[PDB]
Amino acid sequence: ELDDALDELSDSLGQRQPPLDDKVKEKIKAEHSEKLGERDDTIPPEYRHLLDNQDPIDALSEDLD
Amino acid sequence: SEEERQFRKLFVQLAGDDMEVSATELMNILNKVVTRHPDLKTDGFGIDTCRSMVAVMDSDTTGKLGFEEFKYLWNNIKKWQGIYKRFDTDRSGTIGSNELPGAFEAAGFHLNQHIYSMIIRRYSDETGNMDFDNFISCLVRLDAMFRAFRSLDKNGTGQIQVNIQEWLQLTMYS
Amino acid sequence: RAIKYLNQDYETLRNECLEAGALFQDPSFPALPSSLGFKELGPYSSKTRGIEWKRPTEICADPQFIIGGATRTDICQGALGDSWLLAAIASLTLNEEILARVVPLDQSFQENYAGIFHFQFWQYGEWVEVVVDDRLPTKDGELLFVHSAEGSEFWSALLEKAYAKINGCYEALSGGATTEGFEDFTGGIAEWYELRKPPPNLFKIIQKALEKGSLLGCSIDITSAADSEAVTYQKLVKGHAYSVTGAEEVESSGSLQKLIRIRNPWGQVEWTGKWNDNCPSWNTVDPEVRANLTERQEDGEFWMSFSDFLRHYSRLEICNLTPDTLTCDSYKKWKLTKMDGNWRRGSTAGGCRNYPNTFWMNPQYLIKLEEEDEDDEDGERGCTFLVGLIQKHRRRQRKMGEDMHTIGFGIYEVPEELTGQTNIHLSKNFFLTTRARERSDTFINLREVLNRFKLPPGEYVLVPSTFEPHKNGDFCIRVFSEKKADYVDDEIEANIEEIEANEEDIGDGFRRLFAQLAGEDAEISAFELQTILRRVLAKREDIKSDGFSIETCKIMVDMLDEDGSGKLGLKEFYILWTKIQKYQKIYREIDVDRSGTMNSYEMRKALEEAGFKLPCQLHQVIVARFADDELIIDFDNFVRCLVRLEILFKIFKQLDPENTGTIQLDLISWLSFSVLGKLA
Numbered sequence: 001e002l003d004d005a006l007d008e009l010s011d012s013l014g015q016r017q018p019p020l021d022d023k024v025k026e027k028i029k030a031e032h033s034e035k036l037g038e039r040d041d042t043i044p045p046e047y048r049h050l051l052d053n054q055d056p057i058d059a060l061s062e063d064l065d
Numbered sequence: 066s067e068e069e070r071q072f073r074k075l076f077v078q079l080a081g082d083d084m085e086v087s088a089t090e091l092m093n094i095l096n097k098v099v100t101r102h103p104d105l106k107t108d109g110f111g112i113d114t115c116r117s118m119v120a121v122m123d124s125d126t127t128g129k130l131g132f133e134e135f136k137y138l139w140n141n142i143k144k145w146q147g148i149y150k151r152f153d154t155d156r157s158g159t160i161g162s163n164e165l166p167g168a169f170e171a172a173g174f175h176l177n178q179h180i181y182s183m184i185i186r187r188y189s190d191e192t193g194n195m196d197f198d199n200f201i202s203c204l205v206r207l208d209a210m211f212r213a214f215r216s217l218d219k220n221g222t223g224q225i226q227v228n229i230q231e232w233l234q235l236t237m238y239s
Numbered sequence: 240r241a242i243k244y245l246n247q248d249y250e251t252l253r254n255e256c257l258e259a260g261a262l263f264q265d266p267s268f269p270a271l272p273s274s275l276g277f278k279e280l281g282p283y284s285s286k287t288r289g290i291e292w293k294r295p296t297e298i299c300a301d302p303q304f305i306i307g308g309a310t311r312t313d314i315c316q317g318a319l320g321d322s323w324l325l326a327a328i329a330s331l332t333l334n335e336e337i338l339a340r341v342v343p344l345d346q347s348f349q350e351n352y353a354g355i356f357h358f359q360f361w362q363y364g365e366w367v368e369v370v371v372d373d374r375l376p377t378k379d380g381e382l383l384f385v386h387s388a389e390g391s392e393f394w395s396a397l398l399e400k401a402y403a404k405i406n407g408c409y410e411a412l413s414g415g416a417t418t419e420g421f422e423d424f425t426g427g428i429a430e431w432y433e434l435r436k437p438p439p440n441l442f443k444i445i446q447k448a449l450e451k452g453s454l455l456g457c458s459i460d461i462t463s464a465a466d467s468e469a470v471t472y473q474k475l476v477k478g479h480a481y482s483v484t485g486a487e488e489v490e491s492s493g494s495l496q497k498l499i500r501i502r503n504p505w506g507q508v509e510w511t512g513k514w515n516d517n518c519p520s521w522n523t524v525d526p527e528v529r530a531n532l533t534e535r536q537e538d539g540e541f542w543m544s545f546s547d548f549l550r551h552y553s554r555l556e557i558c559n560l561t562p563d564t565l566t567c568d569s570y571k572k573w574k575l576t577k578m579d580g581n582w583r584r585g586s587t588a589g590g591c592r593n594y595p596n597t598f599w600m601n602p603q604y605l606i607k608l609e610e611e612d613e614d615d616e617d618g619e620r621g622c623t624f625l626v627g628l629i630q631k632h633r634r635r636q637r638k639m640g641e642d643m644h645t646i647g648f649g650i651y652e653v654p655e656e657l658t659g660q661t662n663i664h665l666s667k668n669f670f671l672t673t674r675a676r677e678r679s680d681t682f683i684n685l686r687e688v689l690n691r692f693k694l695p696p697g698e699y700v701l702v703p704s705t706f707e708p709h710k711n712g713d714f715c716i717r718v719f720s721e722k723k724a725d726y727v728d729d730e731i732e733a734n735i736e737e738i739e740a741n742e743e744d745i746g747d748g749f750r751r752l753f754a755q756l757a758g759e760d761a762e763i764s765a766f767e768l769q770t771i772l773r774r775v776l777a778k779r780e781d782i783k784s785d786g787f788s789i790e791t792c793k794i795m796v797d798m799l800d801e802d803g804s805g806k807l808g809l810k811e812f813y814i815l816w817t818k819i820q821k822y823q824k825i826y827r828e829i830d831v832d833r834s835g836t837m838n839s840y841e842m843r844k845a846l847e848e849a850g851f852k853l854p855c856q857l858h859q860v861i862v863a864r865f866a867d868d869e870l871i872i873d874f875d876n877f878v879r880c881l882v883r884l885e886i887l888f889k890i891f892k893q894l895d896p897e898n899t900g901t902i903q904l905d906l907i908s909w910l911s912f913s914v915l916g917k918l919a
């Protein structure tokens with residue numbers, strides 16, 4: 001009576017489910033890409049020269065006075 | 066009027082490295098802040114609630130609140146907190162079903178008996194009394210859906226028409 | 240149709256400003272140091288001193304949006320390393336029809352001027368409209384960044400601002416592949432050539448690409464070039480994007496000369512080798528051919544012989560408007576499948592196959608190749624497809640000192656016994672014992688890795704990853720499959736399994752159980768339901784939830800409360816429990832890592848498994864709001880998500896009893912249906 005009903009709801013959910021070492025040992029190599037414009041000397045000289053010439057909670061709590 | 070420059074330095078300290086307040090951080094900010102205010106009774110902001118707040122403010126789809134998003138949310142909370150205190154006329158720290166209409170009205174949500182009753186059913190568990198966190202949560206949502214309507218009613222007819230995609234995209238936030 | 244970035248509507252914001260007699264001030268990308276940068280152009284960089292944001296109307300009295308057309312000479316680099324973007328813009332100007340989609344050509348400083356402009360960018364499978372106010376950074380009265388060779392022209396300046404806006408700031412536009420700009424201006428498909436290993440007939444390929452409206456760029460590898468000299472003795476710039484703007488064959492003193500036209504987005508500093516603007520060998524060409532091809536002009540644009548091009552440049556980047564390779568002599572039919580995903584530390588961020596302990600945690604994607612789609616180009620028989628894995632919003636991470644991840648993907652055959660059965664996840668031991676049938680040509684820190692493949696008909700699993708594990712990022716995948724003669728999916732569907740809840744279906748056993756759970760009033764309330772769910776979940780380790788919220792239970796009640804009782808009677812609780820049984824069956828089956836929770840990938844699978852055919856934008860919306868900051872959804876939120884979605888679909892069909900695309904609502908019932916749900 002009630003504890004039984006809950007056990008029964010639970011049982012109705014069912015039962016779940018159901019080691020190896022790396023056999024193929026597949027390996028991947030990484031490349032780095034070229035980033036165009038990343039170097040400062042790829043910017044026009046003219047525009048290079050142009051460019052180169054209470055703790056917080058208390059403060060907020062205070063907004064709510 | 067540079068409450069603005071002071072609030073910018075304020076946001077930078079709580080936002081941390083990414084310069085954005087996440088749901089987790091916002092949960093921490095809000096819980097710590099309402100700890101100070103015993104008349105703003107609440108069982109806490111959960112991550113569930115805070116994530117919902119971030120979702121609906123998340124204009125740029127970063128998953129966190131940037132300055133402008135936090136500022137808007139905060140200013141709403143600042144306004145709504147005062148509404149809350151004003152219309153807690155029995156000073157119980159919560160908003161009852163009799164206190165609710167006058168408080169949603171003052172926030173700019175002028176509903177009817179039926180709507181208020183459905184709000185009280187959906188957002189009040191405490192015998193028709195609404196916590197500070199449920200209250201903020203509900204108004205954030207109302208505000209979001211209000212903005213959504215205004216934006217979709219561009220001709221200003223008082224009528225929107227949505228397909229299934231925009232319908233689910235707007236309503237699944239709330 | 241096109242996503243409105245930040246929910247800003249151009250015509251709405253322009254019209255309000257015009258009616259207000261105001262000029263637009265964008266609150267989302269304000270005229271402040273934060274919009275410039277974060278390090279080299281941040282608030283604390285001395286390079287930012289004296290910078291003032293000026294509207295074009297503040298720096299001249301008669302600004303033009305476009306004058307003399309929108310042409311490549313309108314794109315001159317300023318004080319930012321965004322050559323990749325600018326070469327993209329320059330190339331785009333050569334295809335007027337596609338240029339007109341990125342740049343609404345009708346904008347003006349003279350009519351309906353309100354200091355607001357708009358642009359359109361392709362962003363990871365979607366077109367996106369971006370509005371900007373016209374305040375542009377200046378120093379010493381001059382535009383600091385991109386500017387037109389025509390001083391009073393502002394379209395390109397405004398385009399670069401709009402593109403800076405979506406990336407957070409201008410400094411974030413520094414460094415990249417020209418393909419990124421090409422793509423964001425076309426949604427096209429990349430084809431890349433290494434010039435040290437070029438295909439034969441590459442000059443014909445280049446000519447064909449240009450004829451066809453493809454966008455072309457080239458560049459010189461700088462790492463493996465004069466350490467600290469980017470500018471070579473022949474005035475070429477290394478590590479810098481150029482546009483390829485033309486290709487002609489000319490007869491020169493009796494000899495055939497293949498010539499390529501190249502543009503430096505500086506709009507200045509040109510090749511000084513053979514065929515430069517001042518080369519005496521132009522006298523050697525027919526006068527009218529000379530007059531049509533060449534001008535003595537410092538504009539960044541020059542000719543060189545194809546031989547010199549091959550000896551000097553490293554790479555040709557090409558963005559075609561179809562998935563068809565340029566080396567093919569016919570057009571094919573194509574199907575795009577767009578998928579999206581997320582790698583998140585703690586769950587889906589598995590890294591590549593070098594990391595077999597976590598590799599199996601990556602999201603997996605089905606690629607089905609059809610017998611009917613078979614072709615035999617190159618004389619190989621199989622199904623042609625392209626996979627392009629693109630990592631998203633990576634420039635916004637620059638502030639964090641984060642850049643592009645090293646990305647790639649592998650393709651695996653699914654075992655015969657597993658065939659025609661979606662929801663499958665290939666295990667760790669599967670990867671430990673079986674090699675990829677195909678992989679990406681490399682793993683590399685490019686925004687996109689795009690490869691062309693041919694495999695036999697069947698079902699394959701694509702595993703996209705970063706190289707190292709525990710890297711956070713969003714991605715999307717484009718799969719282009721070659722097709723025979725079709726004209727699979729484009730619609731939004733809820734094909735959910737409906738339930739038997741007639742009195743005949745419900746037996747004594749369940750009736751006894753219900754009566755025992757309902758108590759004194761013969762009905763189950765939300766409070767009772769929460770207690771029930773708290774209690775049954777307490778018995779099960781395999782179903783994680785942070786308790787079960789009363790607000791979730793209230794929604795479950797309302798979903799099924801067909802009489803108006805406000806509580807659950809026999810048949811209503813039967814439907815509910817049957818739904819709960821299905822929800823947790825799905826949840827546990829799809830629970831690959833047996834975490835007791837759904838990561839973002841598992842949730843996608845569960846939504847499909849529950850019968851929802853949803854676009855990616857919906858899926859992302861679901862993980863936001865229903866997931867935590869680790870992008871994990873527990874059982875409480877899982878049920879809330881699926882319950883709400885079923886509610887929303889059904890509210891939509893109803894209000895639309897005759898299947899038209901749309902629904903009509905006023906503010907009162909909009910706020911009512913979106914906030915309070917089940918009402919009708």
Ligand SMILES: [Ca+2]
Nearest residue numbers: 080081085087
């Ligand atoms: Ca943060």
Ligand SMILES: [Ca+2]
Nearest residue numbers: 127129130131
């Ligand atoms: Ca945000």
Ligand SMILES: [Ca+2]
Nearest residue numbers: 153157159161
């Ligand atoms: Ca009260």
Ligand SMILES: [Ca+2]
Nearest residue numbers: 108196198199
């Ligand atoms: Ca509460």
Ligand SMILES: [Ca+2]
Nearest residue numbers: 306307308313
């Ligand atoms: Ca022009």
Ligand SMILES: [Ca+2]
Nearest residue numbers: 536538540541
């Ligand atoms: Ca020239």
Ligand SMILES: [Ca+2]
Nearest residue numbers: 757758762763
């Ligand atoms: Ca009862």
Ligand SMILES: [Ca+2]
Nearest residue numbers: 800804806808
């Ligand atoms: Ca009922």
Ligand SMILES: [Ca+2]
Nearest residue numbers: 830834836838
């Ligand atoms: Ca899991």
Ligand SMILES: [Ca+2]
Nearest residue numbers: 785873875876
């Ligand atoms: Ca939860």
